[PDB]
Write a protein that binds this ligand. Structure first.
Ligand SMILES: CC(C)c1ccc(O)c(=O)c(O)c1
Ligand SMILES: [Mn+2]
Ligand SMILES: [Mn+2]
Length: 230
């Protein structure tokens, strides 16, 4: 039921260096907030197809967490910032826009439970995006998985892919310790049964309650930065 193979993640590590291409595009950052409790904060940032920061935030309340993440976005030179606005993050827009006052950074609330982005468009690579994915969480996790798989095929099987459709982890920038944390989370993201035959993923709650593993905050952050607002 897992959607991402560890082998793809290994291949994607420094893939831009292996295949000789450079990060090009917008810088997108995303934050997975949490209230004070067991669930850590997540932050991820990419420059185009190259992930450059993965960070985890401990011992913070929700507002401290948002301050931490917006500061990271600023440090990273983000053009776009997203955060998880389902549940506890629903009220964070005010603090977030305040943090970016005077800066050219857009802030977008990500709601993983909503219907997929552009749900009426034909599903590519009669059947629409909305027939395929239950919600945005599923849609953007599969976008991530698709990038990783294409990168794996390019790195390991020498199959050409446009760098725009790939994803590389900058190991030097991210750090080995945080990369290992991320990978342990990404390999636990799993499909759940859906009675309308759509792709749907286990929620953070189901993951910890049904099979006792910690919330994938770093993976959720990375997944949200797959969406580039405008
Ligand atoms: C209640 C728990 C498991 C939970 C719910 C929703 C989220 O968006 C989370 O990001 C999270 O880390 C934990
Ligand atoms: Mn969340
Ligand atoms: Mn979380």
């Amino acid at each position: 039921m897992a959607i991402i193979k560890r082998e793809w993640l290994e291949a994607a590590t420094d893939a831009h260096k292996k295949l000789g291409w450079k990060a090009k595009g917008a810088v997108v950052s995303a934050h997975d907030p949490s209230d004070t409790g067991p669930d850590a904060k997540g932050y991820a940032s990419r420059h185009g197809s190259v992930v450059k920061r993965i960070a985890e935030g401990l011992l913070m309340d929700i507002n401290e967490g948002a301050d931490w993440a917006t500061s990271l976005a600023i440090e990273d030179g983000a053009d776009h910032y997203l955060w998880d606005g389902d549940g506890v993050g629903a009220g964070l827009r005010r603090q977030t826009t305040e943090a970016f006052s005077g800066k050219k950074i857009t802030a977008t609330m990500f709601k993983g439970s909503e219907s997929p982005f552009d749900e009426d468009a034909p599903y590519q690579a009669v059947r629409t995006i909305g027939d395929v994915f239950r919600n945005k969480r599923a849609q953007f996790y599969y976008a991530l998985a698709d990038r990783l798989y294409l990168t794996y095929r390019a790195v390991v099987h020498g199959e050409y892919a446009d760098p725009d459709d790939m994803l590389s982890f900058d190991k030097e920038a991210i750090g080995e310790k945080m990369l290992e944390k991320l990978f342990a989370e990404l390999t636990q993201i799993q499909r759940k049964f859906n009675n309308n035959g759509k792709l749907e993923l286990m929620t953070a709650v189901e993951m910890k309650q049904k099979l006792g593993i910690p919330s994938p905050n770093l993976a959720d952050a990375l997944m949200m930065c797959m969406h580039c607002p405008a």
